[PDB]
Symmetry: D2
Subunit: 121 residues, 4 copies
């Protein structure tokens, strides 16, 4: 089984902690990004997500939202908890980083996309 609970680090150097996931698949955690598109000072930020519980998969898909405390942005991450061929856990994820724009006319350029790989820290 691949469990979300624990401390993780990613390819960019960001760390994240996820507490226990309840019977409904929900969990909370904290995210310390190593990088920012802003020129602001980085602060630890909370995250809230859900792990898919159908078929009690041992490598479930999951999703979570990071509510940034140092900018007006929001990032969502989705991926799957895989059991590496080495028996070690790896989170393969893709994310959408949403910036806030002041006019709906600028909405077309407000969304960045990318990946991140997490391993137990």
């Amino acid at each position: 089984k691949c469990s979300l609970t624990g401390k993780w680090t990613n390819d960019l150097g960001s760390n994240m902690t996820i507490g226990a996931v309840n019977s409904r698949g929900e969990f909370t955690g904290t995210y310390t990004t190593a990088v920012t598109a802003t020129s602001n000072e980085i602060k630890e930020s909370p995250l809230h997500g859900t792990e898919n519980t159908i078929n009690k998969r041992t490598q479930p898909t999951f999703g979570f939202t990071v509510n940034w405390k140092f900018s007006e942005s929001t990032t969502v991450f989705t991926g799957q908890c895989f059991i590496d061929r080495n028996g070690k856990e790896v989170l393969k994820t893709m994310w959408l980083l949403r910036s806030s724009v002041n006019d709906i006319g600028d909405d077309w350029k407000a969304t960045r996309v990318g990946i991140n790989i997490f391993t137990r820290l």
Copy 2:
């Protein structure tokens, strides 16, 4: 002021209902999708999200995860709550739909991307 609480419908015909947003920006609700890439019976699914509260914007940025109850998939949405040029509230969103694959070698094809525009019901 653009608010997330309420009932919404999108360009594909899906409906979403979001409850009250608490002091830390949390919210939950339900999503009834009108379409599916599966060959399964669609079922109302729960969602948990967060909206950014930095600078208490009137057109907040937000994100939420939909935990599908009829499949092993997970979807994440992110976007902004705008007051459109015509005066109506509109949610401009982008999403990542993650399918579950069985081997970490099939991860590359597990993620679909799209958009949805939600309007008040």
Copy 3:
């Protein structure tokens, strides 16, 4: 049949002209974007693409790259030429807008994603 050749306009107000596609599916054209993420003056830019020729589909998928003349960026567009229910042509597309960064350490934030719908002008 849905043909790529012609003059098109999109939901953002951008216009594009595509010449004739040869026996290999290749075509060239020009793109006049109505919007820019830069603060630069917009110039008409050339595009080069290819339409998929397998099974001689009447609604083929296609792809094209826009080589911007007023910035160091590149945008790729992919989609499908659909025959609307009204018998009119519509191009449903998704794009990736790539900005150039100076260090590979900033690569994670260099890519935006979005959609555009085109109709004959």
Copy 4:
């Protein structure tokens, strides 16, 4: 100076060969994918792309379309040609894989997204 011309291989094991880049930034080549989402026999496929020449950057931005010969799909890649911290050329790319659907009502699920890192062969 990062150059596109040559032979490359990526993180999934696919190989690509790009020919000479002309004065207007055009180039063509061939792509042999190592994986497929189809259940078909993979076949070498042609590609046509463009690299941005504005300010004659040494780490250019670029895009290309792969016209798959064994399916009705089309893929577009975009990214930047970097000289990595260790001194090696590396292509950081993101892609959109467009499948063909039969009704414009199924357009929402036709696009997959991912990344690929190419390195010199």
